[PDB]
Amino acid sequence: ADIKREVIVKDDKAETNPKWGFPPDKRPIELHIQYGVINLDKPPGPTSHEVVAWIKRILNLEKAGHGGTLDPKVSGVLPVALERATRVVQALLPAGKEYVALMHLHGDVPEDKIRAVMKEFEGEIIQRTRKVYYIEILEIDGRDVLFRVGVEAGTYIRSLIHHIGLALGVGAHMAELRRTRSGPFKEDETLVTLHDLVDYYHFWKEDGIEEYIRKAIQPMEKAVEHLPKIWIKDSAVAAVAHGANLTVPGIVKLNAGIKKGDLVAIMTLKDELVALGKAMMSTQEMIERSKGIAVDVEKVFMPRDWYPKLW
Amino acid sequence: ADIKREVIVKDDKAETNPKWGFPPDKRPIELHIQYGVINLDKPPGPTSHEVVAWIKRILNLEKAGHGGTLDPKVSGVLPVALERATRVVQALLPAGKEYVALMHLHGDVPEDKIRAVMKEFEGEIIQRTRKVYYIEILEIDGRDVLFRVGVEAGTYIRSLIHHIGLALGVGAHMAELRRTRSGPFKEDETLVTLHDLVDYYHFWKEDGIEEYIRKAIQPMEKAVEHLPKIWIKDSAVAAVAHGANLTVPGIVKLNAGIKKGDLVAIMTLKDELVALGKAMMSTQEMIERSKGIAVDVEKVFMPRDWYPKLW
Amino acid sequence: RIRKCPKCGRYTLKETCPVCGEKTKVAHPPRFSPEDPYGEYRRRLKRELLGIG
């Protein structure tokens, strides 16, 4: 579920100060890292915590955090938010995930049966109740089944495989698991390894080449790409950056379909992430009304200095 | 305690058949490996068991075993006996050991005091009662003490360090440990690493060069170099190889100072290890008497075919 | 057991990619270690494959 949401403009005349802030992808290298997220390919073996610890050491960081814990033996997409953007991984909690898994059946089962049974596991499953968007069988060799599966956040693949084994009557074991997608993070040019990071950091710090480290780290905004957004005026950015909740008068435009309780991303007119919050009203109410709290801000990312309050 | 023992000749005329057996260091490569021991430098991290498992995989072996378990975090001399020689590590149970250790004091102690206290730990210590042959302080930097220690088999260095910390009053922790010697195995040209083994095995199996793998593996006889020995006639070799205990009439020459109960190595006149056993009498009795069981054989290494029984 | 083709990025258990015909590799990044003995070496390969000197 990552289909472009419709945008409804409340203030057609709103403009932004080019001197305040920065286009997300045009931030000075240090700032880029301070507000960056790494689309890391976690290696099997270490825990996610240990991997993050390594990243902090490699990039000489003070803080960092991962989104969606991958177990020790599991490899693949591991979003790691850095420094000031650390908490942006919260935007990934509800993100859907895709995995590639190797299932080992404990008894012989006809290929036709395996395909039919794994076709019925698409949809709601209970492990409590989660949704499996799709199960694509890549290869079947006797007792080994290699398949790709898209799932709702919080779905346990090991349990899914266990239930598939029960349905087949022979039982099954998850021999290997690799996450291929977490929300907006997938196996594309942005997927990097720990060795890549070590080398790119070297090219930057020793050779003065920031190009590679820059490409190896994405702006934190990448983490909220699948979230409903609310774009606000420069003045509202200052207020929110200083701890206030977002009020309706500060809204310029927003995505349709937002409803009270939803996790939303507050954005500047330059598409910079200001803060994550819980919508207090629906898109319609935000457009109709002219006052009141539109969002209860839970976490602010925007530093107070980018869109300063000037008295 | 590895001082050359005196040899007493009982049968001055004994000779050996050059066609039977092989000088230990002149065995065809396959046989050399079948009866070889590796002086491996264990890397920190894996357990000794895991390291042996790796060695079996690298050298495509069926059996292998280590002498003197080194803990996961400990590195250094790890004798690994291969295939048919696997059990020869038993000859290392009573072998003395040397380690290099880094001790971290939990409180400041004057350098003069540290040296005096670690000088008093040389000798008997209880951890139950074991002997510390020597403690040589290499370097002292504040709370860090790097020292070399020679100890009797079964001495726990961690406990030794703990007791030294108690004596200093501040307490101490063993930050790092490396075994530098186990019986006849030490850090010399024969010490090899797992990577060395992988590469030498490649040079042998792919390039047809056995020189390096040969040098990387020592004849099993190396493991009993510190043991009292009894050299026997070719005919006695056949009998012992076929399961019999060694009788006095089969003895050609032997080390002095052997006493009932001692672990001894039975050797052919070509210095090949025939078997390990428990002496049933003393050197003097073996020389004086002319009959009776001299050694209760516990493990036979010599295959039945090298010194065949011919009827 | 899980492998991938360096080309189309196809996941497979086979040693040779079925859709392209090339030796597949383990579908997971190399183990990481704080030592990194060949760091300077592989950097020279990149520093040369990217043109840096």
Next chain:
Amino acid sequence: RIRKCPKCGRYTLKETCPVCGEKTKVAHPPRFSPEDPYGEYRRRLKRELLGIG
């Protein structure tokens, strides 16, 4: 922390050997891994340092 000088094989905690004057290295063998990606590479260094082809 435990280091050794490639020359006299002296054990020390210092970065530079005190008796020889050279950068010391960790007194323990490299971590082992079933992967060994550079196996062919280091073998070429030996296969050349030993003269094998």
